[PDB]
Design a protein around this ligand. Sequence first.
Ligand SMILES: [Ca+2]
Lengths: 137, 136, 131, 143, 141, 144
Amino acid sequence: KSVLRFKKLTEHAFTPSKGSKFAAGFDLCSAYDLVIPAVGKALVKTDIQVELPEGCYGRIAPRSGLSWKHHIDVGAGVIDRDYRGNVGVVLFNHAKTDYEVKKGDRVAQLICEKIIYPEIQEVEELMETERGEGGFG
Amino acid sequence: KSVLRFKKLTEHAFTPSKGSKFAAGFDLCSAYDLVIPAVGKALVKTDIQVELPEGCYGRIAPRSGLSWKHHIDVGAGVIDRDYRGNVGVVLFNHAKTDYEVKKGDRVAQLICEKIIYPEIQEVEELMETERGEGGF
Amino acid sequence: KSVLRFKKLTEHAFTPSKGSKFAAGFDLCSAYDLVIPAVGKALVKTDIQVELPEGCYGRIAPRSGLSWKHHIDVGAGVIDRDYRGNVGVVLFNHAKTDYEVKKGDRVAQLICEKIIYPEIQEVEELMETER
Amino acid sequence: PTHYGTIIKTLRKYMKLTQSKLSERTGFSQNTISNHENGNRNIGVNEIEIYGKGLGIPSYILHRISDEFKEKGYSPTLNDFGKFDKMYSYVNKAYYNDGDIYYSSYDLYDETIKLLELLKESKINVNDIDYDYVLKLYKQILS
Amino acid sequence: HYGTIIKTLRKYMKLTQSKLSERTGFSQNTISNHENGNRNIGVNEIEIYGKGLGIPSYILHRISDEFKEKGYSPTLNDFGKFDKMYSYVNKAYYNDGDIYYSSYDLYDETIKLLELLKESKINVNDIDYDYVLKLYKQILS
Amino acid sequence: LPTHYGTIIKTLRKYMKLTQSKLSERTGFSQNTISNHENGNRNIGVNEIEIYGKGLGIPSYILHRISDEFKEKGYSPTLNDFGKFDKMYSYVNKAYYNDGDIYYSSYDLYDETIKLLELLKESKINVNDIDYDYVLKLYKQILS
Ligand SMILES: [Ca+2]
């Protein structure tokens, strides 16, 4: 099977969890209390390191309730497979008031997005799409 | 094949559509007229519920024309496989002026992003990035 | 293997690159000098066209350092498989200051996101969850 | 559901298809298609997808033509489909090959209509216009 | 700690010592030492127990938080009302947009919502889903 | 302006103590093709640098950055002191993929390796005398 391995860097780290088996991502909980300033930003530390399963990367995706109700956006969000440092959640507070994040509050979710790891190859040929010059048929 | 099933919840729902077979996502149209306030937000209702094909989730992604020309970003955007409620598009209007979304406007696109549903496993070891510490 | 093909449209285009084999995406470099105004936006042109491998699309994803250190988010970001025009990176500068992008600066990364291309079928079932 | 029978019958004849050839693509019987085109049998939303693939036209364009029927009682786009077909090919080539269109477009159908109205305003023939000139007019509509 | 949690939830869901063994893969001796307290349960086993019991593992951690917070777990003491109401909170989250785009934590919203029925004395089997959905929308302002 | 890829590869191949033949079995280029690349008769494309980069054990983008240094300065300080760059680039890669303060604040591993080398030269401190933790502390100061 595919396994997502993690390790708590401090006692403040929380075990990522889902509500159902087919939930898109594991909820990431804030390991500390912090305030994201109005029209500002903050880097939320999860105090965990992850080892992603093969054939994917880790996308830090937003949660619907926190984004819609509190005007919070998730920046960055790309977790490379070989990254073993502290997983940080970049949050943009677009509201005119400060937002109070508490320890243990689920601020985002980690989705193991299947991707292709291809080789890059430069061509001299000018590429052009088939559609057009012909129409329906 | 793989099927994306949907149902119209009201008369105002629109059938999600692509221009070609290999388009990344299905265009989602607003079922109502609404205003996204300046430096504000809005939850646009599509009045549809969806059942996604297996091995993926639904990512509500922005459309290029609306994002660049109108300073609009798509928030949230994660539709779990088991969500059967009204599909909502979270839009952030970062412009200093109000934006008017009208009934039938394509506000985003639905991408069926292939993902892994893995097992979670805690280790006690500090994990190390194991590749290149001895030089080229 | 899977191949991501690209072509330089001008002399100023940069070859997309990764630091290691397990990088999620290829770094996209700005082909020009430009300024992203405060609480504003900018479309950074890479002067490249891409042909993606099968079974995926191109997601223009942000770089971690530029997002956190400079309060910049990447808008749009969906590159269809049949797009052969100049790859543009939509950047939103949410900071109270203007940001100056230099030629060669890695402004984003191109991830080949595996997706499904399914058929759409309208149902009259009211579908309910199973929990 | 509001004039879809006329849409299929008109577009089938526009694409020079017999009722049988469309029957052999869709999988519908010639009798089912005949009742669809005349108005006896109503066409569900899942049949337009099947008819769209059989005709070689995106199904969403058939929905937009139906909206003109609901709005006007007739469809000017369907009345001049030959010019729409030729102009829709130009917007598709420009959308997928030029960044000025890809990063500013909203709807290829609406933008195809606007270009058609601007050629008619300027007394320019579609079959006569070039793609490179059409590309500039597309960039003008998309400010 | 966690051993007491497992014994109460196993008995609530009508499972034998044996039926648990092949769902978990654990031997009955490992399970027996776990439930009384001789052998401690590492955190990778609670997920195995959670799937074997049919309860999300994160609720077992939340029950442990009640022990650390109160010395006992009122949710575990009244798990029947929590289980049936969590079915209602789970159905509302995945079927109503007002909950999906406003929810924060399905456990916390289940716990407080039970307190509003207990505050006004309304019985769980006596409440319907449609009324519970209405009260859910006010707590999510 | 010329790319100077022929001299760059010949210099880096000798730095890795590889013969033209040993590189030939890795790249897949013939020993004659490699010789014409190093001499300057046959031009080296962007896809050949990718093949040479994997054959040498160096990320291909560093070969582009060295070629850019030639176009801007007439010489490459990185190529002249590649041993110090190799040892110093190992520290930034370990720090980038293992430390969150670098992963969420880095801009360019090549550019930051140069400045880190310049700050040791600014203090006239020799690489190889430095520790990883010592360089990591200085790495976090340049990235605020
Ligand atoms: Ca965003």
